[PDB]
RNA sequence: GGCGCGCGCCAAAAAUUUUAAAAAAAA
RNA sequence: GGCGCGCGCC
């Protein structure tokens, strides 16, 4: 029995000695969780591009939020598969949920292997606020296994 | 048996809570309807019909699959939810405009790309954990799959 | 050493420093006029002349230009 | 919880198989982590469009233009390598994506201040000698450590380059050579080798005259003859001074012309001598052993350089019969 | 131990009479005087001269310390007449050999019965005024000279010249080897410790000593301060004495705001001088070029008048009417008469002689109006200014740089006042942005500083010493004036460890074992996070994590800033220097200049400003980091950066995060895992501790920590007392002793054996070496030319970045004499003694060796000082230095037994001494 | 008037000499 | 560029 808790202690403590990224530091008082709490989390990867526009990306991230609080006075909740950044132990109201992360996306030269997706507004594309849809002609129009539109 | 199990297994992927989300305009889904495969298609949109989901998948054409010999014509085809084979994770650069025969052909070379990248198979999506699926029904589909 | 300093071209080939500095003393105060020493030694075709105030330049300029010098206008530029 | 533990580290987890050859550039980038705030949800497209642009951007100078990218930033000692699910074996491919695969920064962007951790790579320890780093604009007053106060182009002294490919950028009180390094002349007057080289002979009014006469008095020789009145006042709780005997004379514009010479004025292109420019209208205008034995040993004392008082002094003093002191205090 | 009681005397005021005396002894008021006064004065005589006068009478020593503007000199004239009078010698030792010159000129002219001894000239041996540089009175003692026989006073002129520190020593050896009949007479500046001087003297010959101290002046003095950059002259200290705090804070504030952002600047002073009728003025720079500089400068000025300008020329002609043709006619003879004539004169060190001595006759007449000269024409005898200027403020010393100490500043303004002519001289001091308020203030109201020996063994005194009989050197060490100031302050220490014994002994907390373990257990918790931070803090480790945004925390020893932005970082060497964004005092960023940052104070508000710090003063380095606005010279963005750092630190009420040191910098040594379990392991204790749980036991901690700190003074107290009663050089005697003995000059049991009796001559030169290499036969191969050339090694003391081009007859002897002195430094080393090989060996500057052949064989001084780079003054010194040294080594080589050393010394004497550079002195 | 070609000439062209200080003194 | 010298073409 001890066994078992003791493999399972050391497995968690091996574990998280890299969890360290995904670890947001405790003790931090943010009300508001739609405004007040993180935005990103960009790791830069070992690639000469994100090594020399480290600067520009950090300026991005600015102008968004300044855009957005300037056009401000001018929902999507998580889907099943978002996780929540494990906080370090040193009311978890508007703490829960502000720590969310929906969406991780691994950016190479010409795809994006991505993982937890997005969210949606019910089952609504057309409606939902991160979705581009592309142009197409549907010259098909015909179900492949049911009776066509 | 082990085809029920499958089965049971996409039919939990397959439920629209937990597929929808990660069907998006370049998510590089494979489509195979019995007998006949076209192979890996990217999704475009998606939307319900009064309840049933169609997916607006882009796959290589003569709907029936093009021929080894030909080229496929890679037109966008609407297929039910549930006919996708495996929702691979992968989502491409799509060009937003594919009309024009030069983007689609792009769209093709990209698709073939990822593929030599790849050698063995491709990355898929795993229902007990990317998905986020907590039903005990699934863990004992899970249990028989491994028995 | 900079807007103190002003440059001369359009030279005929005898001219040497003793001529220019006699020249350009008239306008102000010269210090001193270096013929630039070829890298064989020889002259070269212009010439830098120092003066001791800072407003020389603009009044040698407007003095000394196009003053026809062994039958030859010389072309005076700033620094 | 292992199994959440396991669903939150995954994120961190790269399929294996990946083939790469150029790791510089065949691999992954910034893993950007979206969360449940509206500044992101919003502008998701914005951000994947971002980052889609900068690897053009990159691809539009670096590939096309300059062709230069040799960077040597090794990973910090706070590097991070992604966790991957083993579905193929370890092999020497595998290690170089490993090497690929190395998270060289971490940020979580707040309002106004981001978590940081892992800092940024370096290069030999210095900024400047960096990629990344930006250093703002200060003042640098202080130059006091707070710990220990008490601390071949000719065009710009470059070692790399020549000076006509580089577009970057007292004196011994007898030593008055400044002005007799070739020799000495005189203002106003013409001297003999100006007269010849010039082309102008004794019987032709020296040409700059004409010119000068059409500006005026030079201002060079004005200064020299300029005793600037210092106004400095004793803060307790300008009428300048011109020297009128140093003016330079310049027959033809202020004195008197010389007689014979005639008046070209209407040639070279001049105007007459005018008034104001006379001399005299703007001249005007401005138990010890006793000594028996520690000499015992060693050579006596002597005396050299005998010599007598000079006298010199004295007649000094006597052609000093008055002075400002002596007749003061007589 | 001392045993010197001082008693002062009644007396009027300004003066304060006082009289050091043995303890058994005791005091009555001295006689007053009897008879006829050996010479008597028109003017009026102040208070002071009166009672120098009546102590001079009764034959009890005397030492005077008053300002040289207030007339010194009259007491040692009168005490020479008093000797005169009875037919008893007298001698009159003064610092330098010019000052020499112009006494005896004096004197002879007053008593027309004087001589001169210096090294140079000896008129009239057999007078009975003599006057003499100490140096040649040493070499007397030394030697045993007979004419100290009958002297019955001996006058030190400036004993405050005794804390040089390179020939400060020479006059506390003079005074020790001095028999004890003969009375003293010594003339100071004006100086604090005054007392102890005198209590020395009694101590050291058994006779009683008197001090006279006066703090007056005949003129009243006005300061004034022009700040490079504003216009006028500021009013800082009056006539009356008072400071005026107002005006000098406005010239700073003018300073400062012209720093923030005629043709010269001293060009204006003078000219405003001139035309306000402060005529005659000494400009003081403290550079061979600035005065030359500036004297060139003026070339537009004219104060004589024709009739001056005659009599300038006159005299000018008659002075140089003793040089030859060629001498005459040289460039810097020539090129300083028009400087001359229309009233400018330049005088420093590198000037010839004979220039040097025409300036000071014309400026004592008044011919000369504006003299640029150094410092070494403050010491010029009688010859004041009714004005002063410093162009600088920051001299070069001996060792480095630094701002001129107040007894300078003190000793150059009082050449600044003549008594009757001008009834108010006027002291101009310019400032720059460099100075600022903290080193201003001190300067204009700082005091003399006192007067320390420096005391010294060398070669010399210890062979000398060992040669003669019935004394040791032991008896020197122990007499010096080091030893008798370092025993001085022990009542001082006794008192003090006394009182801190007592305040130990006082305070008493309740509990004293689990209180005392307590303490101990939370300092070493300290000590450990202290190793932890320290092993945070390394190259590999920190860097990375500052940027240009990072938070950090930054405290020094005892003063924390608190929370600061990483503004930047730079190496340097190796060491790091990192630039942060700190909080800052109004009164610490005035006084930035030359000042280290100081944290602003919390109830009042502050500036924030950037600081460099090193890595080992980072306390924490918080991993938040700010969006920093990359332009922070406005005050506007750095008041920006505040109210961020406001509201992160206001976001986070339980503190702010720390970078873990373990996992988030990257670290994984053993070590950093065994310093956190021990703390751990200690935290624990504490908590489980019974004392700890319990709250309100900060008190006892404080008052713990309280004993602790007495603890520590008491045991810094009782090594200082322990360490201050035996000899302080004994140990440097003995390392001496052993290389004197380990070379071949004394013997087993401190016997004085040939090589070091014929050491004990050569005195001006380095003796060891200089013996070593005369014994070996290194002299015996070279020529007269030659030896003459590579004596002038040991000569020169002069910086020099040019360098020799030495040739195949001048360089190779050098090689022989470099490993000569290899060997001896090396021998030296062996001993124990701290002697550097390096720099022991660079202090033989071989730059002179070509100038000196060429000039030693019939050539020009034009020719020669067109050979080199060094001012002519710097040349003559050292060939006038090598004459000297040549004589003694030709005294040696007789000593010896060997006769050809002596020709080739005699030789090169010979040649060596002919022209302008041995021109006899005009003073004489 | 118009147009084409061999060419001296001044007209105007550039030009623009790259590498840390310091006082005093003697047997 | 034109002073234009010179030759040729419409
Ligand atoms: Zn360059």
Not at chain 2, 109 to 123: A, M, T
Not at chain 4, 275 to 295: E, G, H, R, T
Not at chain 5, 136 to 156: D, K, P, Q, T
Request: hydrophobic fraction near 40%.
């Amino acid at each position: 029995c001890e066994e078992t808790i003791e493999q399972l202690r050391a497995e968690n403590q091996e574990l998280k000695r890299k969890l360290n990224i995904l670890t947001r530091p405790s003790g931090i008082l943010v009300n508001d969780t739609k405004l007040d709490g993180p935005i990103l989390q960009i790791l830069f990867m070992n690639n000469a591009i994100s090594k020399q526009y480290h600067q520009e990306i950090e300026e991005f991230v600015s102008n968004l939020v300044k855009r957005f609080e300037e056009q401000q006075k001018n929902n999507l909740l998580p889907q099943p598969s978002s996780i929540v950044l494990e906080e370090d132990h040193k009311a978890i109201k508007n703490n829960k949920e502000a720590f969310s992360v929906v969406g991780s996306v691994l950016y190479f030269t010409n795809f994006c292997l991505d993982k937890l997706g997005q969210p949606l507004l019910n089952e609504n594309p057309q409606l939902s606020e991160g979705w581009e849809i592309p142009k197409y002609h549907q010259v098909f129009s015909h179900i492949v296994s049911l009776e066509g539109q | 048996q082990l085809a029920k199990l499958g089965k049971e297994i996409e039919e939990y992927i397959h439920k629209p809570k937990y597929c929808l989300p990660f069907l998006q305009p370049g998510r590089l889904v494979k489509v195979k309807n019995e007998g006949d495969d076209f192979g890996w298609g990217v999704v475009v949109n998606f939307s319900k019909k009064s309840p049933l989901y169609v997916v607006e998948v882009l796959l290589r054409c003569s709907a029936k699959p093009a021929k080894p010999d030909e080229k496929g014509e890679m037109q966008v085809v609407p297929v039910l939810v549930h006919l996708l084979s495996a929702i691979s994770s992968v989502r491409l650069y799509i060009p937003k405009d594919l009309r024009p025969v030069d983007n689609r052909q792009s769209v093709l070379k990209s698709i073939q790309e990822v593929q030599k990248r790849f050698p063995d198979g491709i990355p898929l999506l795993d229902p007990i954990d990317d998905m986020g699926i907590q039903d005990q029904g699934l863990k004992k589909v899970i249990q028989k799959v491994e028995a | 050493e900079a807007d103190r300093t002003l440059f001369v071209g359009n030279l005929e080939t005898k001219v040497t420093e003793e001529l220019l500095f006699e020249l350009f003393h008239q306008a102000g105060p010269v210090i001193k006029v270096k013929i630039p020493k070829d890298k064989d030694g020889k002259p070269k075709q212009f010439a830098f002349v120092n003066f001791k105030h800072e407003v020389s330049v603009p009044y040698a300029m407007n003095l000394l230009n196009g003053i026809k010098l062994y039958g030859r206008p010389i072309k005076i530029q700033f620094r | 919880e292992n199994q959440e533990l396991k669903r939150k580290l995954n994120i961190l987890t790269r399929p294996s198989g990946i083939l790469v050859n150029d790791t510089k550039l065949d691999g992954p980038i910034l893993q950007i982590l979206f969360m449940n705030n509206a500044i992101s949800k919003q502008y998701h497209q914005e951000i994947e469009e971002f980052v889609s642009n900068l690897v053009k951007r990159f691809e539009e100078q670096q590939k096309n233009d300059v062709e230069k990218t040799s960077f040597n930033l090794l990973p910090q000692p706070s590097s991070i390598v992604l966790e991957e699910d083993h579905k193929v074996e370890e092999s020497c491919a595998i290690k170089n994506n490993k090497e690929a695969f190395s998270v060289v920064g971490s940020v979580l962007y707040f309002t106004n201040f981001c978590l940081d951790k892992l800092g940024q790579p370096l290069l030999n320890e210095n900024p400047q000698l960096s990629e990344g780093w930006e250093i703002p604009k200060y003042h640098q007053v202080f130059s006091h450590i707070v710990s220990l106060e008490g601390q071949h182009c000719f065009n710009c002294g470059s070692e790399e380059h020549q000076m006509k490919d580089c577009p970057m950028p007292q004196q011994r009180y007898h030593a008055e050579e400044v002005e007799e390094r070739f020799g000495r002349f005189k203002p106003g007057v013409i001297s003999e080798e100006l007269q010849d080289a010039l082309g102008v002979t004794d019987k032709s009014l020296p040409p700059f005259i004409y010119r000068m006469r059409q500006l005026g008095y030079p201002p060079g020789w004005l200064k020299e003859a300029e005793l600037e009145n210092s106004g400095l006042a004793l803060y307790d709780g300008k009428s300048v001074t011109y020297d009128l005997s140093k003016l330079v004379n310049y027959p033809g514009f202020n004195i008197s012309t010389p007689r014979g010479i005639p008046d070209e004025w209407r040639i070279f292109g001049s105007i007459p001598m005018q008034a104001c420019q006379q001399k005299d209208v703007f001249a005007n205008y401005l138990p010890i052993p006793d000594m028996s034995k520690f000499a015992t040993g060693i050579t006596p004392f002597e005396f050299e350089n005998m010599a007598e008082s000079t006298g010199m002094y004295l007649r000094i003093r006597s052609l000093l019969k008055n002075s400002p002191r002596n007749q003061q205090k007589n | 131990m001392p045993r010197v009681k001082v008693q002062s005397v009644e007396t009027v005021e300004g003066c304060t009479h006082e009289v050091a005396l043995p303890a058994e002894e005791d005091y009555l008021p001295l006689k007053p005087r009897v008879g006829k006064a050996a010479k008597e004065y028109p003017f009026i005589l102040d208070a002071f001269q009166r009672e120098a006068i009546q102590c001079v009478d009764n034959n009890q020593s005397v030492l005077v310390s008053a300002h040289t503007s207030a007339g010194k000199t009259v007491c040692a004239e009168y005490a020479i007449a008093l000797a005169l009078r009875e037919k008893q010698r007298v001698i009159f030792t003064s610092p330098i050999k010019a000052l020499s010159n112009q006494k005896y000129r004096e004197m002879y002219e007053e008593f027309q019965d004087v001589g001169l001894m210096t090294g140079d000239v000896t008129i009239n041996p057999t007078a009975s005024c003599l006057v003499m540089t100490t140096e040649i009175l040493r070499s007397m003692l030394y030697r045993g000279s007979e004419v100290m026989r009958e002297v019955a006073w001996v006058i030190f002129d400036e004993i405050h010249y005794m804390r040089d520190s390179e020939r400060g020593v020479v006059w506390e050896e003079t005074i020790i080897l001095l028999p004890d009949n003969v009375h003293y007479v010594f003339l100071s500046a004006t100086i604090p410790n005054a007392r102890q001087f005198a209590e020395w003297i009694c101590h050291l010959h058994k006779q009683p000593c008197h001090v006279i101290y006066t703090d007056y002046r005949p003129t009243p003095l006005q300061h004034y301060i022009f700040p490079a950059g504003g216009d006028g002259l500021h009013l800082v200290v009056d006539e009356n004495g008072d400071f005026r705090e107002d005006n000098f804070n406005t010239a700073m504030q003018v300073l400062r705001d012209a720093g923030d952002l005629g043709p010269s600047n001293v060009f204006k002073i003078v000219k405003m001088i001139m035309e306000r009728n402060f005529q005659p003025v000494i400009i003081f720079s403290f550079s061979k070029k600035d005065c030359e500089a500036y004297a060139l400068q003026m070339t537009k000025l004219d104060f004589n008048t024709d009739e001056e300008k005659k009599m300038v020329e006159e005299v000018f002609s008659n002075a140089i009417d003793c040089l030859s043709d060629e001498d005459k006619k040289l460039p810097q003879v020539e090129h300083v008469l028009p400087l001359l004539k229309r009233g400018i004169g330049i005088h420093h060190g590198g000037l010839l002689p004979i220039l040097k001595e025409t300036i000071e006759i014309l400026f004592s007449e008044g011919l000369i109006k504006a003299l640029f000269a150094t410092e070494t024409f403050a010491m010029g005898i009688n010859m004041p200014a009714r004005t002063v200027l410093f162009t600088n403020a920051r001299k070069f010393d001996g060792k480095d740089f630094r701002w001129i100490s107040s007894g300078e500043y003190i000793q150059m303004s009082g050449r600044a006042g003549r008594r009757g002519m001008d009834d108010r001289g006027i002291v101009i001091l310019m400032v720059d942005e460099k100075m600022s308020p903290t080193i201003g203030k001190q300067l204009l109201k700082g005091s003399a500083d006192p007067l320390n020996s420096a005391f010294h063994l060398t070669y010399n005194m210890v062979l000398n010493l060992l040669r003669v009989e019935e004394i040791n050197p032991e008896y020197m060490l122990e007499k010096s004036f080091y030893q008798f100031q370092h025993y001085r302050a022990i009542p001082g220490v006794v008192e003090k460890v006394k009182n801190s014994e007592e305040q130990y002994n006082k305070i008493v907390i309740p509990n004293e074992e689990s209180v005392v373990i307590y303490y101990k257990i939370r300092q070493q918790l300290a000590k450990l996070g202290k190793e932890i931070e320290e092993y945070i803090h390394k190259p590999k480790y920190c860097l990375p994590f500052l940027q240009p945004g990072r938070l950090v925390k930054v405290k020094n020893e005892g003063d924390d800033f608190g929370w600061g932005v990483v503004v930047n970082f730079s190496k340097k060497s190796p060491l790091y220097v990192v630039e942060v964004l700190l909080r800052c005092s109004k009164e610490s960023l005035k006084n930035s200049a030359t000042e280290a940052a100081k944290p602003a104070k919390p109830d009042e508000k502050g500036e924030m400003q950037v600081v460099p710090v090193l890595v080992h003063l980072l306390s924490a380095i918080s991993s938040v980091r700010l969006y920093i606005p990359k332009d922070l010279r406005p005050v506007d963005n750095r008041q920006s950066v505040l109210k961020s750092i406001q509201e992160v630190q206001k976001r986070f009420p339980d503190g702010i995060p720390l970078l873990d040191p373990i996992d988030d910098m990257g670290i994984q040594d053993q070590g950093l895992k065994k310093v956190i379990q021990k703390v751990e392991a200690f935290e624990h204790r504490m908590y489980s501790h019974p004392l700890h749980n319990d709250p309100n036991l900060e008190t006892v901690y404080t008052l713990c920590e309280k004993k602790a700190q007495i603890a520590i003074d008491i045991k810094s107290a009782k090594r200082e007392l322990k360490k201050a009663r035996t000899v302080l050089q004994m140990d440097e005697l003995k390392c001496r002793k052993r290389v004197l003995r380990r070379l071949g000059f004394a013997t087993s049991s401190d016997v004085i054996e040939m090589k070091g009796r014929v050491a004990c001559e050569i005195s001006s030169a380095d003796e060891l070496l200089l013996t070593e290499m005369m014994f070996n036969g290194l002299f015996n191969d070279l020529s007269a030319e030659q030896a003459t050339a590579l004596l002038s090694c040991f000569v020169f003391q002069e910086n020099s970045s040019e360098m020799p081009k030495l040739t195949e007859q001048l360089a190779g002897p050098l090689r022989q004499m470099q490993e000569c002195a290899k060997r001896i430094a090396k021998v030296s080393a062996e001993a124990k003694l701290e002697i550097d090989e390096e720099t022991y060996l660079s202090s033989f500057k071989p730059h002179l060796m070509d100038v000196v052949y060429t000039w030693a064989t019939g050539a020009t001084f034009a020719h020669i000082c067109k050979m080199t780079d060094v001012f002519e003054g710097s040349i003559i010194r050292c060939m006038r230095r090598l004459e000297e040294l040549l004589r003694q080594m030709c005294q040696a080589a007789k000593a010896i037994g060997n006769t050809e050393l002596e020709n080739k010394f005699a030789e090169g004497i010979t040649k060596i001494k002919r022209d302008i550079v041995f021109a006899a002195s005009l003073y004489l």
